[PDB]
Amino acid sequence: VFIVDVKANKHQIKQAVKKLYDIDVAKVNTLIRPDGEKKAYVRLAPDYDALDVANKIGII
């Protein structure tokens, strides 16, 4: 789960997460929060685990 720029679309979120975390993602679901920020649910590819990626990202 990420907080992203409101002007970024699903394609841009997909590329952004791919290069600066070196992971492959399956799909991106997007909503705009009531506070105005955009939230992205980025589902990783089956061969990637979201737990160790979050561990090395630092959001455990």
Report the length, in residues, of the chain: 60
Residues that bind other proteins (CB under 8 A): 20, 32-36, 51-52, 54-55, 57-60
Q: State the minimum distance, in angstroms, from the CB of residue 51 to other proteins.
A: 6
Tell me whether residue 34 or residue 46 sits nearer to other proteins (CB atom). 34
Least separation, in Å, of the C-beta of 35 and other proteins? 6
Q: CA–CA separation, 30 vs 42, rounded Å?
A: 9
Return d(Cα 13, Cα 44) in angstroms, integer: 13
Q: Is 52 helix (H, G, I), strand (E, B) or coil?
A: helix
- 11 or 60: whose CB is closer to other proteins? 60
